[PDB]
């Protein structure tokens, strides 16, 4: 009646269904599509599906876990910024917010009416997430490698040197699954991985 998941139809459904895609008024209002809240939704089938993923997509389970972790640490960091602003945030917390913005705005977000986003195949999906989280790991390493060192590689030094790679990362969503087949998409994303590694190597 008001989007409330305590309503008896939802409560009875939730005791039965193995998957629940909790769409959220705040996301729908800000026109975030497809409006799924990534901290309320769940899928009890992960246990079973991990057999298929470990046969066909061995990188995906690590990425899936790191994604939800990054997105939950986004809620922690986003709540405290209302009071403290940026002043307490570690350089790793900045890298967490930057990648959480990429994952929220350029991976989770998807336009249901525009041909570039009407449907997204799994090879595109895993490749997008692989790149965004490989950036998180390499950026987090670039910061933490300089802990107590004579000079710190800051989030801003990263963000400035990686600016082309950040634009490429956000651009991954634009590949057309019809004209750009999975082979071409995987090849382009493999070039993004190499470019990403080499851009980080300039600071290590």
């Amino acid at each position: 009646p008001g989007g409330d998941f305590s309503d008896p139809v939802t409560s009875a459904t939730l005791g039965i269904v193995q998957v629940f895609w909790g769409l959220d008024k705040k996301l729908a209002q800000r026109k975030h599509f497809p409006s799924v809240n990534w901290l309320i939704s769940y899928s009890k089938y992960m246990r079973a599906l991990d057999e298929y993923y470990d046969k066909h997509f061995t990188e995906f389970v690590p990425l899936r876990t790191k994604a939800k972790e990054i997105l939950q640490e986004e809620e922690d960091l986003a709540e405290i910024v209302q009071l403290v602003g940026k002043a307490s945030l570690a350089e790793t917390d900045k890298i967490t917010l930057e990648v959480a913005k990429l994952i929220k705005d350029d991976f989770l977000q998807q336009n249901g009416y525009t041909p570039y986003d009407r449907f997204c195949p799994f090879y595109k999906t895993v490749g997008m997430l692989s790149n965004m989280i490989s950036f998180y790991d390499m950026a987090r390493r670039a910061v933490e490698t300089t802990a107590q060192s004579d000079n710190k590689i800051t989030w801003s030094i990263i963000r400035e040197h990686m600016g082309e790679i950040l634009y490429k990362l956000s651009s991954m969503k634009f590949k057309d699954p019809v004209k750009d087949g999975e082979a071409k998409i995987k090849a382009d994303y493999a070039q993004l991985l190499e470019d990403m590694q080499n851009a980080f190597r300039s600071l290590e």
Partner: protein, 218 residues
Amino acid sequence: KDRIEIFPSRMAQTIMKARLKGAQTGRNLLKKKSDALTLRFRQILKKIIETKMLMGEVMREAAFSLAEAKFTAGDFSTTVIQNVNKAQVKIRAKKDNVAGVTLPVFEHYHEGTDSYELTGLARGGEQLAKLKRNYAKAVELLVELASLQTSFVTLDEAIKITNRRVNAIEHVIIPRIERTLAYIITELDEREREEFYRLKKIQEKKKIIKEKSEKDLE
């Protein structure tokens, strides 16, 4: 006024509990901010008292060194006051983010060139060199004391603001949420009684219709 005017529903109970956790979290975060700033403010006050004691000593020594300079140099003061050009010592402002707040401070910077380099060549120049160094030490301690003052006044302001936010959460926002939640729980128990009463009457009507339907077969 006394309540948030959210209309009572099982949804509204959930939203008020979510907001209460929000307000209690914001209270504790702002209380941690207040504690951290208050710790720095007490430390900075301790440093002010210590630095004013050090300032008393360096100023006694420097002021005594003026008597020494007046011994061997005569009235050098009129020459020093009248001839002024550029400051050998200047301050630059700087920001400290300690305790999750911006505190302004000053740094002691020195330009090399002595604006009174030749003063005392006729007499007193040895004692004037000692005097120059003593007042330079006084200025170094005063730049630190100013940094403590700018920090202290900025913490006084920031603690007053933060404690007002904490007390506004504790005495306005949380009480509005708690009264609103108690009201919503009350009106939800009222709606539960209306449904109990309505359903008891329905069951009574069915009992009467069952009895009448049996009596009509006799």
